[PDB]
Paper text:
Serial crystallography at conventional synchrotron light sources (SSX) offers the possibility to routinely collect data at room temperature using micrometre-sized crystals of biological macromolecules. We show here the versatility of this setup and methodology by performing structural studies at room temperature (RT) of three additional enzyme systems of biological relevance: (i) Klebsiella pneumoniae CTX-M-14 β-lactamase, a β-lactamase relevant to multi-antibiotic resistance mechanisms; (ii) Nectria haematococca xylanase GH11, a highly active xylanase suitable for industrial applications; and (iii) Aspergillus flavus urate oxidase (UOX) in the presence of the long-lived intermediate-like 5-per­oxy-9-methyl-isourate (5PMUA).
From these 5000 images, 5109 crystals could be indexed with CrystFEL and data collection statistics show that with these 5109 indexed crystals, a full dataset to about 1.55 Å resolution can be obtained. This means that less than 3.5 min of data collection time is needed to obtain a full serial crystallography dataset to near-atomic resolution using monochromatic X-rays at a synchrotron. For these 5109 indexed crystals, a total of no more than 34 µg of protein in roughly 3.3 µl of microcrystalline suspension was used. This corresponds to only 6.65 ng of protein consumed per indexable detector frame. In comparison, 6250 ng per detector frame was used in the first SSX experiment and 89 ng per detector frame for the lysozyme mix-and-diffuse study, a drastic reduction in sample consumption. Again, the refinement statistics and the resulting electron density maps are of excellent quality. The datasets collected here allowed us to determine the first non-cryogenic structure of inhibitor-free CTX-M-14. Like in the EuXFEL structure, two N-terminal residues that could be built in the cryogenic structure (E25 and T26) could not be built in all three RT-SSX structures due to the absence of interpretable electron density.
Author numbering: 27 to 57, 59 to 238, 240 to 288
The structure:
Amino acid sequence: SAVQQKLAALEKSSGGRLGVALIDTADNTQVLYRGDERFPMCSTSKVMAAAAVLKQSETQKQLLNQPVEIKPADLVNYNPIAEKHVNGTMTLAELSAAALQYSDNTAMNKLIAQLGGPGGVTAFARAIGDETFRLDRTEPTLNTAIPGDPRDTTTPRAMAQTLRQLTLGHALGETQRAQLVTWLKGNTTGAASIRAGLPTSWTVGDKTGSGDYGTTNDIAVIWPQGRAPLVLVTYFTQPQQNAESRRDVLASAARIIAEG
């Protein structure tokens, strides 16, 4: 496969380890590169926590409007939105939007708490048929991305299938799914990642992640004009703990995929 040789070449040029899964919902064909290797999720895990809260709201129909206190002690390392509301409240919807669209880490920790800890996020993954995802820690320590460490990892294949079911499938109810899609389409952190390798005409919803070891990730749902949507996951990590982020690799991987 030409796409697999070009992805292997991109990886060699980059000096890191690249993982890719594409699902084409037209024929449900899959393109995988290191699809069964584990990669640190970093903030791409926020999608699962938000979806788990949405699933709870199918029965607790007013759950997303519940106010949650933001206190100074709740603040961690990166809280662009929560900081604007310390000693006030945010609703669970506002926290979900902040975690997804601004990668707010305090918001992620509040979602984890609502689910009863990391094990409650993992439980949701299992409930929708994802046996691979594991969330072990809260923010910010889930981003340590230590080589070989299985904590807070998943595989590209697994995350593609799960993102498909959440956004285009029916793992969530109809209003919950629509809300997730709307949040993802509204992400503000993704301009330099998958979006940058795709035609400007295509609609993307995505969630970025970054961490130590130069870990640079993006998971996306893509709606090409007049064509079936695609799911694309791109994970990348590097050998030096201090390595710089490489969002250009993810753009390049998307461009390779789009060429095919």
